Amino acid sequence: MDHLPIFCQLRDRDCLIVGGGDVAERKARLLLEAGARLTVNALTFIPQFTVWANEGMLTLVEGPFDETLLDSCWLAIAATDDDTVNQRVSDAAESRRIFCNVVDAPKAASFIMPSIIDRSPLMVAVSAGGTSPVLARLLREKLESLLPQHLGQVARYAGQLRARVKKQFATMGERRRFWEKFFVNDRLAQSLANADEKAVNATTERLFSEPLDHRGEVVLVGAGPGDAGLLTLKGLQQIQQADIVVYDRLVSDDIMNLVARDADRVFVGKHCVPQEEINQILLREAQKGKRVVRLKGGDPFIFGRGGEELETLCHAGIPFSVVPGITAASGCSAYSGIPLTHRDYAQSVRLVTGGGELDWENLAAEKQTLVFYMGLNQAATIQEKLIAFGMQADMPVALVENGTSVKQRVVHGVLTQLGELAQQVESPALIIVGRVVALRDKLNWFSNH
Amino acid sequence: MDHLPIFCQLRDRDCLIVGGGDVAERKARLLLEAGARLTVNALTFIPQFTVWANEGMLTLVEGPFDETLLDSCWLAIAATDDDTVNQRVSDAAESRRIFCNVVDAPKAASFIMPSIIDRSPLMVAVSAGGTSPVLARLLREKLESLLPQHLGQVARYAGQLRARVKKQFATMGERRRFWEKFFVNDRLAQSLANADEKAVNATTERLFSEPLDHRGEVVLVGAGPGDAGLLTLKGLQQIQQADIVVYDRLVSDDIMNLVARDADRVFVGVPQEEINQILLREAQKGKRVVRLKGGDPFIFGRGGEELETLCHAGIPFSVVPGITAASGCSAYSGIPLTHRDYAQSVRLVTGHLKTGGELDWENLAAEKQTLVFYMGLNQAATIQEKLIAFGMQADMPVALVENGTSVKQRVVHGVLTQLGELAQQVESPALIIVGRVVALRDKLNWFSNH
Ligand SMILES: Nc1ncnc2c1ncn2[C@@H]1O[C@H](CSCC[C@H](N)C(=O)O)[C@@H](O)[C@H]1O
Ligand SMILES: Nc1ncnc2c1ncn2[C@@H]1O[C@H](CSCC[C@H](N)C(=O)O)[C@@H](O)[C@H]1O
Ligand SMILES: [Cl-]
Ligand SMILES: [Cl-]
C-alpha cells in the first residue's frame, strides 16, 4: 500500500493554503466545505478570496510565505506556480510533522488529495497515488451517477435506529436484510429530504410492521427516446434496485442493457396487448412484495398512458413514484439540430397525437412549432389539412426517425412534400412543422443515417 | 462535508498505537503495510505483536501510556478498551496537533479509518463516519463488484508512462485526450494482465502516434428543473469533464455540486449576445466549455442563439437535452400532461413576448389541451381574463407549481377564475398549468404537499 487513506475531522482546525490563484481557490473551497479554520497566504489574491475574507469565512495574509504561519496548523497545501515557494512550504511542514500536499507534485509531499464523492456522513474517495488522475476522475463520475443525491440523510437516520433494529431482529440474517430494504426505500429518502416528518415516522413504522420479505412499490421510469446516455441519474438508480422491470418495444436495447443482472424482466410490448393487462401485471407483481420498475419510452406522462397505470395502483394502496424522462420531442430536437423555439419563431410548442378528430384550423395558426407523435399514418392528411386551413406552403417540415439513436434518420423540406417524405421513414418517428426546422442546416451536429 | 479524505504517505514516518489486543492488531497491520515506523504501547499484547516484534517490524513499549511517545509522531491510534486511557491519548495528540483515531469512538478525536477497496496503486475508500457501518459495508461490496481486478496494472502502467506523456504532448488538452483513450482501451488492459509486452508496446506506440484534436468545444447541457437526480447520464459526464461551465440562476445548487471541482464556473444570471461571446471566447482558447441551462436547452432557453455563432466560427458543438420544466413539474405534482381523452395537445407557451406581440388567445382557449405557461406569473391575471373571454370554461382547473422537483416545491391549485389570485401566492420560477388533467393531482400526487 503506497498511501493510507484517512478521513480527517477539520471543523475549526487551523489549516494553511499557500497561493492565491485559481488552483488555491479550488482547494480553499474544499477546505471551507470541511469546516477548516483557513488561512491563505499569497503574494496576491484573486477576487473570490477577498469576497470570502469580507464574509469572514477565512483569513488572508498578503506577502511572501511565512513559515511561522504553520506553527498551529494541522494541514498545509502548497498551491502556487513557483516550485521554489512550494518546496519551502513542503520543507517547513515536514519539519513540523504537518501533512502537506503540493498541488502540482503529488509525490513531492506527504499527502495526496483524492477525488471525493460527498454524501455526508457517507463519503467515498478515489486515488491512484498520482499515477492516474484521469482514471480517478472517470471513477468519480461513475460513482456520482450511482449514489442517490440524498443518501446521506438516510445514513444519518439509520444510525438513530441502530438499537431499535437490533431488538426486533435478533438474527444478523434478518437484521442485515432489514438494512438492505431500508437504504433502498424511496418514500423514506423522500420524506427525509422534504422534511415531511409524519411520513418519516409513518414509513419507519411501516418498514418494521410489514413482513421483512415485502418491499412492494411501483416506480414509473422514463427511459428517454433511445440513447442510453439520456436516462436520468435517478432512473438508472431505480433500475439498478428493481426486483422486476416491466418494459415494452419503445425502451431501447441500450437502456435495457443497464438493467440489473438479477432483475426479472417482463416484456409487455409485442396481435396486440390491452392496457388493462399491463395495469394488472404491475398490480400483481407489486402485490407479491416486489420492487417494480415500469420502464416506458420517453416521458411516462406524455402520451405514455402513465396516469392510467398509476390509477390502478392508487386503488390498491400500492406506493408509487414517477421519474420523468426526456420526451421524444426534446430528444429529436436536440439531436436533429431543430430547436423547438428560437427568437420570435414560435410563441408555443404543440405536442399533438395522431375519439374525435384534430382541430385543423387550430393546428394551422401561425407562430407555432408543431410536433406530431404517432402521426406517420395520417401524414398525407396532415399535409392536405394544414394547406387547406391556410398554413403557408413554404413552411419547413422535418421527420426524425429513431431520434437520438445510432440509426437516427432525419428528412426535411417544405410542407407541400410532407406526405411522401413520410413514406421514407417508419415508426418510431416524429413530424416537426414550423419555421424552426430551417435552423437544422446551421445547428445539425449528430450523425445522419 | 463531515470529513476531508486525504491519502497519507506514511513511509518511514513515526506513528503510535496505544493498546495491544485484536483492534490494535488490525490497525497495526494497516500501518505496517503503509510503511509506517510504528510503536505500540500497551499493558499486554496478543501473540501477533510478538511475531512482528521478533521480525523487527515495529517497537513494543510494554506498560501504561507514555505521552512522550507522541512527540515525534504523525498519526496516533487509541485502541484500548479503557475509555479513560483512550481519552488521555486523544487529549495528548490534540495538544500536539497529531491526527488521532479513537477506534471505539468515531465522533471523538480527529480522524476515522475508512473501509478500503484495493487495486493498488488505485484505492477507493468508503466510510459513513460511524453513523451507519452497515451502509459502508454494503457500499464497499458493490464497489468491489464494479472495479476490475486488473485495474491496478493499468494504473501502474499509466504512472510509468507519465513522464513520456508530459514530454511528448505540449498541452494539457492533448495529454488529457491521451489518458481518456488509454484508460478505456480494453485490449491494453488485457495485454497488461497477460504480461504480453509485445502487444502492450504495439497498442502503446499507436496511441502515442494518433493525432489529437486541439479543438475546444461547446456543449449545451440541460440541467433539468432542479432535482439533481434528473440530470442525464450524458449531462453528468459533460460537467464532470468540462474545463469551464457557464451557468445561470435556474440551474440548482445541487446540480452545481456535480460540476467537476477543477472546472472554472462563470455565472450569467446580462444580455444574450454577452453570453454568446463568452462561449465563443472560451472555446476559441481550446477549452471544453459546457453551457449548463435550466430545464431543456431548446425549449425557451435561447440555446439556438448560443449555437448559431459557432457553426461558421469553426467551433464544434453538441446538445444534451434535459428534462423541461413541464415534464418535471408534471411528474412531481401528480398532474400528467396527457391522460386518456383529456388532452389531444400539450401546449408549451411563453408568458413574456416581444414588446409588441401578443398571444393568440382564441387558439389557446380551445378544448382538449393542456396549457403550460413558462415565465407567465406577471401575466397571470391577463391570462385568466383572456382565456375566459375566448370561451374557456370558468371552472377549468388550474395549478401553479413553484420550484418544481426541488425539496422546496410548492403547488397551489384551483379554477380558472382564481388564477390571478393564485399566482400572487407563488414566485418565480413557477409554471402555470391549465387543463382538466389538473384534477388528477388528488389521485396521482406522490411527492409531497410541501
Ligand atoms: N426515438 C424516437 N424518435 C422519434 N420519435 C419517437 C421516438 N420515441 C418515441 N417517439 C414518438 O413517440 C410515439 C409513441 S407515444 C410515446 C411517447 C413517449 N411517452 C415520449 O415521451 O416520447 C411514436 O409513435 C413516435 O412518434
Ligand atoms: N423548477 C421549476 N419549477 C417551475 N417552473 C420552472 C422551473 N424551472 C424553470 N421553470 C419555468 O421556466 C421559465 C424559464 S424559461 C427556461 C425554460 C427551460 N429551458 C425549460 O425547459 O424548463 C421560468 O420562468 C418558469 O416558468
Ligand atoms: Cl492518481
Ligand atoms: Cl460508518
Side-chain angles (χ1 to χ4, degrees), chain A residues 15-89:
Chain A
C15 301
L16 180 68
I17 290 175
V18 180
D22 292 327
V23 168
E25 187 273 346
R26 295 169 199 138
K27 303 301 162 177
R29 183 174 303 278
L30 187 55
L31 265 47
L32 287 179
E33 280 163 21
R37 181 155 62 214
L38 182 61
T39 296
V40 190
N41 167 224
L43 299 170
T44 188
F45 299 99
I46 60 174
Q48 175 65 255
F49 281 107
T50 47
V51 161
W52 281 327
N54 295 331
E55 298 170 355
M57 299 189 60
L58 45 70
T59 299
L60 302 181
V61 175
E62 212 181 359
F65 170 56
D66 174 15
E67 86 174 296
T68 81
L69 288 185
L70 296 164
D71 280 350
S72 291
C73 280
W74 293 72
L75 278 190
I77 300 180
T80 85
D81 268 357
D82 190 327
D83 281 343
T84 297
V85 177
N86 295 336
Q87 188 67 34
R88 294 207 309 259
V89 178

Side-chain angles (χ1 to χ4, degrees), chain A residues 225-226 250 297-304 326-329 332 372-375 400-404 427-430:
Chain A
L250 301 185
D299 185 79
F301 280 173
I302 292 175
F303 303 122
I326 303 286
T327 190
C332 291
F372 290 90
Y373 287 66
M374 299 167 290
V400 185
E401 168 189 332
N402 286 311
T404 77
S427 70
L430 281 189

